[PDB]
């Protein structure tokens with residue numbers, strides 16, 4: 001189960017730049033990442049609901065999914081504690097000086113598929129899958145995160161409130177662009193994966209980093225996708241077909257993550273590893 005943590009369990013903190021994200025040295029359980037979602041007056045009205053939600057998110061246990069280690073539910077001070085990921089996010093690793101070989105990239109892809117197929121299996125629909133939500137360890141292994149709290153309703157409300165003393169649309173499925181009421185599905189995440197797949201090979205953010213505008217939104221809704229020819233490095237035929245299939249306008253035409261795994265695992269083993 002979830003650990004109810006005290007600020008006294010930590011030796012000290014190293015605050016950095018949404019939300020106060022401090023690196024924290026725990027007394028016995030090691031190095032950890034902490035997010036102080038709220039600081040201010042007491043709000044005993046939501047403590048039971050916040051604790052229920054953290055217990056819910058704490059039930060998510062997989063090798064390729066970020067582990068929620070604990071919570072700090074103190075008077076007027078709320079915090080979420082996750083594990084430490086040394087190499088930061090997927091975009092940071094791709095935009096680095098050092099090139100990441102095809103074998104590593106192909107492993108990264110397989111690990112994303114696995115983590116997403118686990119989440120979907122537990123009924124979790126990500127809604128915000130993007131390179132910033134994919135964290136990397138020192139050994140280039142990845143874990144899927146929900147850093148923007150899109151799957152925490154109670155804790156997302158704390159982060160954005162009056163009493164507190166404190167994104168990109170390129171990966172968004174077109175059924176959600178200019179349609180905030182449609183309920184997201186497993187196929188909404190499959191679309192996001194397709195653009196993550198592109199970004200892994202282009203080593204950059206899509207659509208020339210043009211501010212999300214009505215012109216761009218309408219173009220993606222019409223059928224516009226990131227420029228495949230903007231990929232300079234070697235990208236196998238199979239991976240270009242996969243991304244083109246996953247970013248299909250019709251959600252019903254996109255595969256499932258267990259479906260993607262069944263075809264991608266043999267391809268990685270025989271051709272990429």
Ligand SMILES: N#Cc1cc(N2CCC(C(=O)N3NCC[C@H]3c3cc(F)cc(F)c3)CC2)ncn1
Pocket residue numbers: 019021033034035057058060065066067068080081082119124126144145146147149151
């Ligand atoms: N900045 C920042 C930041 C965040 C943070 N959190 C704790 C981990 C949370 C988290 O991601 N998860 N929790 C358990 C399963 C996992 C999870 C993954 C996923 F893909 C979807 C999902 F619904 C839940 C995200 C919030 N702690 C510290 N610092």
